PDB file of C-alpha atoms and ligand atoms in Angstrom:
ATOM      1  CA  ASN Q   1     -25.813  -2.906  10.722  1.00 24.67           C
ATOM      2  CA  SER Q   2     -25.939   0.380  10.928  1.00 25.89           C
ATOM      3  CA  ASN Q   3     -29.650   1.091  11.852  1.00 24.53           C
ATOM      4  CA  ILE Q   4     -29.303   5.064  10.667  1.00 20.76           C
ATOM      5  CA  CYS Q   5     -27.826   6.064   7.149  1.00 21.81           C
ATOM      6  CA  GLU Q   6     -24.214   5.908   6.297  1.00 26.24           C
ATOM      7  CA  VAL Q   7     -24.604   9.297   4.532  1.00 24.01           C
ATOM      8  CA  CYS Q   8     -27.842  11.630   6.806  1.00 17.99           C
ATOM      9  CA  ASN Q   9     -27.599   9.611   9.140  1.00 17.34           C
ATOM     10  CA  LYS Q  10     -31.149   9.376   9.870  1.00 18.63           C
ATOM     11  CA  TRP Q  11     -33.020   5.848  10.386  1.00 19.19           C
ATOM     12  CA  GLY Q  12     -34.867   4.997   7.412  1.00 18.21           C
ATOM     13  CA  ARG Q  13     -35.711   2.803   4.789  1.00 19.29           C
ATOM     14  CA  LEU Q  14     -32.371   1.511   5.514  1.00 17.91           C
ATOM     15  CA  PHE Q  15     -30.550  -1.140   2.002  1.00 16.85           C
ATOM     16  CA  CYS Q  16     -27.478  -2.907   4.345  1.00 18.16           C
ATOM     17  CA  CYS Q  17     -23.702  -3.297   2.263  1.00 15.63           C
ATOM     18  CA  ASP Q  18     -23.264  -7.496   2.441  1.00 16.37           C
ATOM     19  CA  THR Q  19     -19.679  -6.996   2.510  1.00 16.96           C
ATOM     20  CA  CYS Q  20     -19.558  -4.432   5.507  1.00 18.10           C
ATOM     21  CA  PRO Q  21     -22.040  -2.773   8.635  1.00 14.65           C
ATOM     22  CA  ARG Q  22     -22.497  -0.095   6.661  1.00 12.21           C
ATOM     23  CA  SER Q  23     -26.387   1.240   5.286  1.00 11.77           C
ATOM     24  CA  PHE Q  24     -27.880   3.382   3.472  1.00 10.87           C
ATOM     25  CA  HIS Q  25     -30.936   5.363   2.322  1.00 10.17           C
ATOM     26  CA  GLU Q  26     -31.997   4.669  -1.648  1.00  8.64           C
ATOM     27  CA  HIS Q  27     -31.191   8.463  -2.733  1.00  8.14           C
ATOM     28  CA  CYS Q  28     -27.761   8.682  -0.127  1.00  7.94           C
ATOM     29  CA  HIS Q  29     -25.751   6.177  -2.115  1.00  9.45           C
ATOM     30  CA  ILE Q  30     -24.186   7.621  -4.799  1.00  8.14           C
ATOM     31  CA  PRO Q  31     -24.403   5.886  -7.359  1.00  5.40           C
ATOM     32  CA  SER Q  32     -28.306   5.822  -6.077  1.00  4.46           C
ATOM     33  CA  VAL Q  33     -28.876   1.474  -4.222  1.00  3.34           C
ATOM     34  CA  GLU Q  34     -29.220  -0.215  -7.574  1.00  2.00           C
ATOM     35  CA  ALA Q  35     -32.861  -2.597  -8.310  1.00  2.03           C
ATOM     36  CA  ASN Q  36     -31.213  -5.532  -7.442  1.00  2.00           C
ATOM     37  CA  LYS Q  37     -28.319  -7.647  -7.395  1.00  2.00           C
ATOM     38  CA  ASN Q  38     -27.775  -9.929  -3.728  1.00  2.00           C
ATOM     39  CA  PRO Q  39     -25.108  -9.461  -2.516  1.00  2.32           C
ATOM     40  CA  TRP Q  40     -24.253  -5.477  -2.750  1.00  2.00           C
ATOM     41  CA  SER Q  41     -22.019  -4.266  -2.245  1.00  2.00           C
ATOM     42  CA  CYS Q  42     -22.126  -0.304  -1.120  1.00  6.01           C
ATOM     43  CA  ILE Q  43     -19.567   2.288  -2.073  1.00  5.72           C
ATOM     44  CA  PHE Q  44     -16.694   2.190   0.466  1.00  2.00           C
ATOM     45  CA  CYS Q  45     -16.693  -1.822  -0.003  1.00  2.00           C
ATOM     46  CA  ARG Q  46     -16.124  -0.526  -4.097  1.00  2.67           C
ATOM     47  CA  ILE Q  47     -13.697   1.335  -3.724  1.00  3.69           C
ATOM     48  CA  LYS Q  48     -11.926  -0.667  -1.017  1.00  2.00           C
ATOM     49  CA  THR Q  49     -11.787  -3.232  -3.871  1.00  2.00           C
ATOM     50  CA  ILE Q  50     -10.439  -1.108  -6.649  1.00  2.00           C
ATOM     51  CA  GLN Q  51      -7.331  -0.183  -3.804  1.00  2.00           C
ATOM     52  CA  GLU Q  52      -6.979  -4.069  -3.038  1.00  2.74           C
ATOM     53  CA  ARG Q  53      -6.200  -5.315  -6.641  1.00  2.00           C
ATOM     54  CA  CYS Q  54      -3.724  -1.770  -7.503  1.00  7.40           C
ATOM     55  CA  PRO Q  55      -2.008  -2.082  -4.196  1.00  5.27           C
ATOM     56  CA  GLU Q  56      -0.096   0.602  -6.107  1.00  5.55           C
ATOM     57  CA  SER Q  57      -3.224   2.877  -6.985  1.00  5.85           C
ATOM     58  CA  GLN Q  58      -2.231   4.022  -3.004  1.00  7.56           C
ATOM     59  CA  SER Q  59       1.803   5.754  -4.382  1.00  8.06           C
ATOM     60  CA  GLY Q  60       1.479  10.131  -4.699  1.00  8.57           C
ATOM     61  CA  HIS Q  61       0.175  11.189  -7.355  1.00  8.50           C
ATOM     62  CA  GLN Q  62       0.417  14.625  -9.122  1.00 10.15           C
ATOM     63  CA  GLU Q  63      -3.205  16.365  -9.114  1.00  9.14           C
ATOM     64  CA  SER Q  64      -2.202  17.498 -12.601  1.00  9.79           C
ATOM     65  CA  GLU Q  65      -1.826  13.547 -13.774  1.00 12.27           C
ATOM     66  CA  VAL Q  66      -5.006  13.326 -12.240  1.00 13.01           C
ATOM     67  CA  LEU Q  67      -7.463  15.853 -13.016  1.00 11.90           C
ATOM     68  CA  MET Q  68      -7.047  14.955 -17.197  1.00 10.92           C
ATOM     69  CA  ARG Q  69      -7.069  11.491 -16.392  1.00  9.22           C
ATOM     70  CA  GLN Q  70     -10.781  10.157 -18.560  1.00  9.06           C
ATOM     71  CA  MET Q  71     -13.289   9.124 -16.765  1.00  9.74           C
ATOM     72  CA  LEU Q  72     -13.332   5.589 -17.449  1.00  9.00           C
ATOM     73  CA  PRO Q  73     -14.905   3.233 -14.950  1.00  8.57           C
ATOM     74  CA  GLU Q  74     -12.670   3.231 -11.964  1.00 10.65           C
ATOM     75  CA  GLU Q  75     -12.597   7.203 -12.179  1.00  8.67           C
ATOM     76  CA  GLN Q  76     -16.236   7.218 -12.535  1.00  6.96           C
ATOM     77  CA  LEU Q  77     -17.006   6.081  -8.479  1.00  3.71           C
ATOM     78  CA  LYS Q  78     -13.266   7.841  -7.595  1.00  3.65           C
ATOM     79  CA  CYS Q  79     -15.835  11.120  -8.011  1.00  2.00           C
ATOM     80  CA  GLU Q  80     -19.342   9.310  -7.212  1.00  5.83           C
ATOM     81  CA  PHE Q  81     -17.856   8.897  -3.477  1.00  4.64           C
ATOM     82  CA  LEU Q  82     -16.028  12.200  -3.625  1.00  5.65           C
ATOM     83  CA  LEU Q  83     -19.533  13.605  -3.620  1.00  8.95           C
ATOM     84  CA  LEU Q  84     -20.487  11.108  -1.678  1.00  8.61           C
ATOM     85  CA  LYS Q  85     -17.307  12.597   0.817  1.00  6.01           C
ATOM     86  CA  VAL Q  86     -19.307  15.725   0.554  1.00  9.60           C
ATOM     87  CA  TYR Q  87     -22.902  15.167   1.374  1.00  8.85           C
ATOM     88  CA  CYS Q  88     -22.162  12.947   4.296  1.00  5.63           C
ATOM     89  CA  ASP Q  89     -20.785  16.404   5.806  1.00  7.62           C
ATOM     90  CA  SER Q  90     -24.309  18.337   7.227  1.00  6.08           C
ATOM     91  CA  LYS Q  91     -23.033  21.773   6.337  1.00  8.03           C
ATOM     92  CA  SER Q  92     -23.222  19.784   2.456  1.00  6.51           C
ATOM     93  CA  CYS Q  93     -27.072  20.812   3.455  1.00  6.16           C
ATOM     94  CA  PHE Q  94     -25.745  24.723   2.223  1.00  9.07           C
ATOM     95  CA  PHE Q  95     -25.193  23.957  -0.776  1.00  9.31           C
ATOM     96  CA  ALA Q  96     -27.248  21.102  -2.318  1.00 10.47           C
ATOM     97  CA  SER Q  97     -30.354  22.513  -4.135  1.00 10.06           C
ATOM     98  CA  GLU Q  98     -30.663  25.504  -6.292  1.00  9.75           C
ATOM     99  CA  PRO Q  99     -28.860  28.730  -4.452  1.00  9.70           C
ATOM    100  CA  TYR Q 100     -30.366  32.260  -5.440  1.00 12.01           C
ATOM    101  CA  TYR Q 101     -28.619  35.362  -4.755  1.00 11.61           C
ATOM    102  CA  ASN Q 102     -30.581  39.007  -3.695  1.00 12.08           C
ATOM    103  CA  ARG Q 103     -28.186  40.391  -1.109  1.00  9.85           C
ATOM    104  CA  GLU Q 104     -27.538  44.253  -1.073  1.00  7.29           C
ATOM    105  CA  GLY Q 105     -24.061  45.446  -2.509  1.00  4.12           C
ATOM    106  CA  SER Q 106     -23.454  41.554  -4.199  1.00  3.81           C
ATOM    107  CA  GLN Q 107     -24.253  40.548  -7.582  1.00  5.03           C
ATOM    108  CA  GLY Q 108     -25.334  36.533  -8.113  1.00  7.41           C
ATOM    109  CA  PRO Q 109     -21.943  34.277  -9.307  1.00  6.19           C
ATOM    110  CA  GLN Q 110     -22.507  34.039 -13.423  1.00  7.11           C
ATOM    111  CA  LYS Q 111     -22.196  30.344 -13.233  1.00 10.26           C
ATOM    112  CA  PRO Q 112     -24.465  29.547  -9.854  1.00  7.98           C
ATOM    113  CA  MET Q 113     -22.959  25.517  -9.608  1.00  5.97           C
ATOM    114  CA  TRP Q 114     -24.633  22.874  -6.401  1.00  5.46           C
ATOM    115  CA  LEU Q 115     -24.516  19.431  -5.470  1.00  8.44           C
ATOM    116  CA  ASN Q 116     -27.956  17.378  -6.656  1.00  7.84           C
ATOM    117  CA  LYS Q 117     -26.921  19.506 -10.027  1.00  7.42           C
ATOM    118  CA  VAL Q 118     -22.457  18.030 -10.578  1.00  7.55           C
ATOM    119  CA  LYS Q 119     -25.285  14.363  -9.069  1.00  6.54           C
ATOM    120  CA  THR Q 120     -27.454  13.830 -12.144  1.00  7.53           C
ATOM    121  CA  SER Q 121     -23.926  15.338 -14.147  1.00  5.54           C
ATOM    122  CA  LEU Q 122     -22.026  12.316 -12.968  1.00  3.06           C
ATOM    123  CA  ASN Q 123     -25.388  10.456 -13.339  1.00  3.95           C
ATOM    124  CA  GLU Q 124     -25.919  11.035 -16.551  1.00  2.00           C
ATOM    125  CA  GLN Q 125     -22.145  10.515 -17.788  1.00  2.00           C
ATOM    126  CA  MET Q 126     -21.651  14.309 -18.148  1.00  2.00           C
ATOM    127  CA  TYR Q 127     -18.333  14.740 -17.833  1.00  3.13           C
ATOM    128  CA  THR Q 128     -15.010  12.945 -19.728  1.00  5.07           C
ATOM    129  CA  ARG Q 129     -12.309  13.758 -17.510  1.00  5.98           C
ATOM    130  CA  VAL Q 130     -11.523  13.896 -13.975  1.00  8.10           C
ATOM    131  CA  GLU Q 131     -10.943  18.459 -14.306  1.00  7.96           C
ATOM    132  CA  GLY Q 132     -14.455  18.221 -15.285  1.00  7.18           C
ATOM    133  CA  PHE Q 133     -15.460  17.340 -12.324  1.00  5.45           C
ATOM    134  CA  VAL Q 134     -13.505  18.696 -10.032  1.00  4.11           C
ATOM    135  CA  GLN Q 135     -14.250  21.873 -10.838  1.00  4.45           C
ATOM    136  CA  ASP Q 136     -17.613  21.847 -10.928  1.00  6.01           C
ATOM    137  CA  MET Q 137     -16.946  21.362  -6.894  1.00  2.00           C
ATOM    138  CA  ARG Q 138     -14.196  23.714  -6.516  1.00  3.87           C
ATOM    139  CA  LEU Q 139     -16.711  26.297  -8.177  1.00  4.95           C
ATOM    140  CA  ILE Q 140     -19.603  25.213  -5.693  1.00  6.45           C
ATOM    141  CA  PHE Q 141     -16.995  26.765  -3.022  1.00  6.13           C
ATOM    142  CA  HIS Q 142     -15.497  30.315  -4.819  1.00  4.69           C
ATOM    143  CA  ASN Q 143     -19.289  31.675  -6.005  1.00  6.28           C
ATOM    144  CA  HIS Q 144     -20.377  30.820  -2.046  1.00  5.44           C
ATOM    145  CA  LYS Q 145     -16.634  32.687  -0.997  1.00  6.02           C
ATOM    146  CA  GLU Q 146     -17.414  35.800  -4.021  1.00  4.55           C
ATOM    147  CA  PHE Q 147     -21.301  36.165  -2.544  1.00  4.31           C
ATOM    148  CA  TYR Q 148     -20.997  36.845   0.870  1.00  2.20           C
ATOM    149  CA  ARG Q 149     -18.041  38.637   1.291  1.00  3.19           C
ATOM    150  CA  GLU Q 150     -16.980  39.921   4.560  1.00  2.30           C
ATOM    151  CA  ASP Q 151     -20.298  38.239   6.048  1.00  2.09           C
ATOM    152  CA  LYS Q 152     -18.992  35.785   8.143  1.00  5.39           C
ATOM    153  CA  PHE Q 153     -21.646  32.933   6.504  1.00  4.61           C
ATOM    154  CA  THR Q 154     -18.516  32.844   3.691  1.00  2.72           C
ATOM    155  CA  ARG Q 155     -16.631  30.660   7.003  1.00  3.73           C
ATOM    156  CA  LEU Q 156     -19.212  27.174   5.005  1.00  2.81           C
ATOM    157  CA  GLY Q 157     -17.821  27.449   1.677  1.00  2.00           C
ATOM    158  CA  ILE Q 158     -14.145  27.712   3.952  1.00  2.00           C
ATOM    159  CA  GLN Q 159     -15.354  24.216   5.985  1.00  2.00           C
ATOM    160  CA  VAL Q 160     -17.289  22.214   2.864  1.00  2.00           C
ATOM    161  CA  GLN Q 161     -13.968  23.215   0.959  1.00  2.00           C
ATOM    162  CA  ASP Q 162     -11.814  21.412   3.261  1.00  2.00           C
ATOM    163  CA  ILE Q 163     -13.440  18.071   3.052  1.00  2.00           C
ATOM    164  CA  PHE Q 164     -14.099  18.001  -0.455  1.00  2.00           C
ATOM    165  CA  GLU Q 165     -10.086  18.663  -1.126  1.00  2.00           C
ATOM    166  CA  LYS Q 166      -9.050  16.119   2.128  1.00  2.00           C
ATOM    167  CA  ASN Q 167     -11.385  13.797   0.339  1.00  2.00           C
ATOM    168  CA  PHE Q 168      -9.558  14.404  -2.967  1.00  2.00           C
ATOM    169  CA  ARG Q 169      -5.834  14.142  -1.482  1.00  3.08           C
ATOM    170  CA  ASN Q 170      -6.404  10.396   0.133  1.00  2.50           C
ATOM    171  CA  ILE Q 171      -8.985   9.137  -2.646  1.00  2.00           C
ATOM    172  CA  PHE Q 172      -6.307  10.325  -5.568  1.00  2.00           C
ATOM    173  CA  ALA Q 173      -4.415   9.465  -3.574  1.00  2.00           C
ATOM    174  CA  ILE Q 174      -2.269  12.565  -4.700  1.00  2.00           C
ATOM    175  CA  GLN Q 175       1.724  13.068  -3.781  1.00  2.00           C
ATOM    176  CA  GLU Q 176       1.319  14.724   0.119  1.00  2.00           C
ATOM    177  CA  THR Q 177       3.882  18.423   0.603  1.00  2.00           C
ATOM    178  CA  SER Q 178       4.352  20.486   3.209  1.00  2.00           C
TER     179      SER Q 178
HETATM  180 ZN1  LIG N   1     -29.381   9.131   4.558  1.00  2.00          ZN
HETATM  181 ZN1  LIG N   2     -20.258  -1.873   2.288  1.00  2.00          ZN
HETATM  182 ZN1  LIG N   3      -1.627  -4.959  -9.717  1.00  2.00          ZN
END
């Protein structure tokens, strides 16, 4: 197994996947690494299994259909994985914890949002459809772009949104377009 966490790239107290060489901090994995379960298979492995059991699941889909899906166990897992892919980028630090807003010439967003809030909401089964999760994720970046205006720091929101959107298209097999 790897000797660093797949998510944060640090060493520490790591749990190792039994079916692939990845390792994780307990609360870096989503969902948090399960108490018992030997063998244990990471989220990467669980997602690969879904694909392998239903090869047709990789054919192109329309976003509007994906968003209306109910949060059954496989869609729950796919959103957990997508969230984890965002945490994998180090620039996610900016969006992880609860933000505050006090900048001359700007007003804070009406509905603040952040990664750890989305993580809690998934853990608590608060989303009934994929749309709920995707709307909160996109709200993170939209709030940031609006608040930072022409400051060059707005670019961090564009960057992490791009990671989100590329992973969304990959995990939910969105039909490729020009
Ligand atoms: Zn970690
Ligand atoms: Zn694995
Ligand atoms: Zn099948």
